[PDB]
Design a protein around this nucleic acid. Sequence first.
DNA 1: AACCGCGC
DNA 2: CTGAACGCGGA
Length: 1126
Amino acid sequence: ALSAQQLLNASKIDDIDSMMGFERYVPPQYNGRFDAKDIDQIPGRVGWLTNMHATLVSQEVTTNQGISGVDFYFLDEEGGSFKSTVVYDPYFFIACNDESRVNDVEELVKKYLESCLKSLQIIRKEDLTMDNHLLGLQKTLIKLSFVNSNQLFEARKLLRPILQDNANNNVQRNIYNVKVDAKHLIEDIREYDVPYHVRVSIDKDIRVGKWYKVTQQGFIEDTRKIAFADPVVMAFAIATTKPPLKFPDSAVDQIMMISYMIDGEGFLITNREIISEDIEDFEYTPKPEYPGFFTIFNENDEVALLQRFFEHIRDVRPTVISTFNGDFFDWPFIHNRSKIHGLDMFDEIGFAPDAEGEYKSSYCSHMDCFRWVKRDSYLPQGSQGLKAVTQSKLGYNPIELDPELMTPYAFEKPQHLSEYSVSDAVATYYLYMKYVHPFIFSLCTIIPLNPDETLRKGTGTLCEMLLMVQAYQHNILLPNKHTDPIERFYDGHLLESETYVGGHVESLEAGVFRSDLKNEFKIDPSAIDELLQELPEALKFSVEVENKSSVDKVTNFEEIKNQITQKLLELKENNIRNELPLIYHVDVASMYPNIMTTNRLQPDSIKAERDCASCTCARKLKWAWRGEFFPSKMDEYNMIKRALQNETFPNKNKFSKKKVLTFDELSYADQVIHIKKRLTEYSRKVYHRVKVSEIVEREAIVCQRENPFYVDTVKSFRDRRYEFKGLAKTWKGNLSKIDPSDKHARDEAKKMIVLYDSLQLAHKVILNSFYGYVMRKGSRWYSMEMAGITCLTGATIIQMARALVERVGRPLELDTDGIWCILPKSFPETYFFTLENGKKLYLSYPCSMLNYRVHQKFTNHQYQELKDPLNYIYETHSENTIFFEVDGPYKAMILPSSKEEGKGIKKRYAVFNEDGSLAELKGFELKRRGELQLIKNFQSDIFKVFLEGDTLEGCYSAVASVCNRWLDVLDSHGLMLEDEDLVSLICENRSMSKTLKEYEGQKSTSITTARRLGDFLGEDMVKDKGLQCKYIISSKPFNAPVTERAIPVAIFSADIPIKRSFLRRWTLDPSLEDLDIRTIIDWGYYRERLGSAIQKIITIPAALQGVSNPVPRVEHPDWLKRKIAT
DNA sequence: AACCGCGC
DNA sequence: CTGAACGCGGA
Ligand SMILES: Nc1ncnc2c1ncn2[C@H]1C[C@H](O)[C@@H](COP(=O)(O)OP(=O)(O)OP(=O)(O)O)O1
Ligand SMILES: [Cl-]
Ligand SMILES: [Cl-]
Ligand SMILES: [Mg+2]
Ligand SMILES: [Zn+2]
């Protein structure tokens, strides 16, 4: 029935595909031996696999219904392309609670599912919840196969009610009786929701990005070919008209240009109803690497521009089309204008919106670079615009044009608009080719998804897909998706939430620290004595564990060891010192993954007294659980329920004629939501607050012999990441090694650094998601304990490192697995052991001294591993892959202080390299999206000025002067400033993550700005999420809270009568005549925001370093004034 | 004082 | 259709 309609869609997709160069190839019959080694004899066709999609195909011993399979899209060795199809029966499993009667379940379902089922068979998989699975005992399952996905789904609909009824109702008849019936032996269904395209990719072991010979026997991987083929790649950007101060609307606005690149050649299509002259061919090439020669197609009108776009696409047959935010802007705009002119985009080029509203084709991936930017670039959201991505990643400054000017320029400056247009397409193309393409296509060679999907899935889902492969290949039955309990209780209280204590963070010092200014150190001599004692084993560890060598082959072991001993002896004698610091950072390499692999942590290894039989074997580890719960007691929970049972509720389901519901008729979940809300208020009143928070120390057993498929998946991804982390580092060394002796065109090395950095960090987030995965909603491998255990072990490790550094130096800031500190310049630093072959091994003593201790204290001596699987013989050993590494030493580090007494600021600092360049800027407003622009421009001026002066006081003086420049701008009420520049500086921009409707009963500057934009510029302004609310704070109304005084800066570009009516409303001043921004602004508000910044970054830290207020126009808070009396 | 949205 | 900790300024 629906079968026959899906067959019609397939057949339409087949026509699109043949038009774009993908005819279905069916390889020749070959009765011989499907053999993989003589691949070159066997009949068939070799191809680079570039895409795949589920489909439904006809026969050409079933009926008049379609067969599920997957179309795979290939590029051939000869410059052509084709597709070929694999068919496979979808399947899922039934599990039983009584093995002895598996035959009765089988007989029952053969019949119960007669209308949908293709076949059935008894199979066995490893079940990691089952006793004696480690001695080879397997779980027996019924595998149910189907002709297609529709039939699979009917099986699920027939079976779900049985499983419901089984868990839901007690059927008593003869109370004096209870040969049980078949239904109740079905305990569950398993692997029932694995998406079909994935199921095929996993079971057949096929991946996009690899080369296959297609044969009658199936796809044969060509392991000899690894280099990718070269798809035809197109990138495009559109430019549209729009009204002043509003957003483009595709119902009325028109497309004026489409710029694009195809394999490095530019095209610009122009709409001459709008663009007021024929644009000529021109070059925009921002680096020799990025050529852009553009050819022009001046079309008479909009429809022609569209027809020219589609026809060109049909001409070149791109198999990647890339955009920047094309799923949300470009594509839908193109689709809606196409429809207005009676064109069918799907018929013209095979693109349509999918169920997510995203634009997809069969034959061509839509690689929206913005998705890679948000997921994988590691850029702050403040730098995720094309402009900022272009500077960061391609290393040049693209053309910029104010959005308000694009429509007018069509008429007035059509050449300038076209230069902007083509700049977009250039940035987009090369961003795609250099960053997105290699990453996504390479990820596809290991993740069982197509490029579109691989670009867009969450990193947690990516992890899931990796783990599923590993589980499937080791024959491990997948757990079903976890579902959170609707309500949990602790000590009779309902929990609002529960979690575990995470990373450990500390602010220890504020101030300016610089390699040419001296600091006071107080060395604990008993620390030096421990170091001296450990020294022989610590250097041996460096040689043999950190460098994988043997002291045996070391020439100068004793020399190095004397040299260190002397520096330490000196520190021990003369332990009160005043000298120049070494500014170091030490940080554990991939911290949580290594804690996990060291301790053999994975969800299936967490045993709760059952049932390793028995769980030497058990490794007990601590975590810290933290609950937040209502004060109310059970008895008062029960009270609130019956008060809700007297109430009426609206039917949320819109499909139904019934719109009043009793409490009992709502689902468990919704019942609880209402309970929670009523319990919030009852608690305040009686108690008197919402949450009570409590931390409880806990313990869990981690079995050291459990099947290690999960942790092995993490180790393997970790090694994949280290390769790129290593390359990043190797290139950094070369650019300083000898390759930095100007002049050179390396340049290439710097390009390398940026690339491998991006690649090791794109790997970092997926790697770390293997940790987060165990807490994800719907995780197949859920374990709060595993996650808790990981974090507490890391907190203990990093406090141990802090306790040492603090005895020999001064730690400044600490976060999770990293410590910024200063050490005396006399502290022993870097050496190189000489090998017999003459080679040298690097030693950073600050790092090795910590790592030696980490290995004494945090090694897992209980790690087991199958040494002989046929016999199940285990071997035990000692594991530890946790290592600090060192970066630095640096020229300076500047840490801010809080406005509150005795409190620091975590997660904000600035660090500078020896060469004077900025090495790190963390957390500050400058980096964050949105934020008051004046504060960003301030911070952007001040940090580098900490490198000036010869004394600490001179350094604070140089920065005072910049503070006084900025204070003059505000004391002068902006007068010394252009009016455009003023609006720009005073503006605060904040994203609303949802739409204005969903914020009801909340207040904030964004909400008020959005509402007023709505009233003034129309409801279209606020129908979408992600609105940028740009506003200023007004002096009036006096006595109103700040959120009532956000004015959208857009109002200052409205016609004068409009502006007037609104500023009057918004300030509650009927008779206002003065409309100058300068009289509207609340200067005291801005002076207080700037004052704050000056306190945290400059004056209060100055005070803590015993420097007297270098910026007197900003007064210390009282506590600090008071502090300074004697 | 305790909460909320956004952004290692 | 990954996690927790934190800074800021808004009863
Ligand atoms: N995105 C994340 N998701 C979950 N956990 C994270 C994430 N980012 C950081 N963490 C946790 C796990 C990390 O191991 C730990 C330390 O972070 P960090 O030192 O930045 O990275 P790392 O130790 O994993 O890599 P690196 O090798 O570069 O130091 O904090
Ligand atoms: Cl971030
Ligand atoms: Cl975020
Ligand atoms: Mg780290
Ligand atoms: Zn065990």
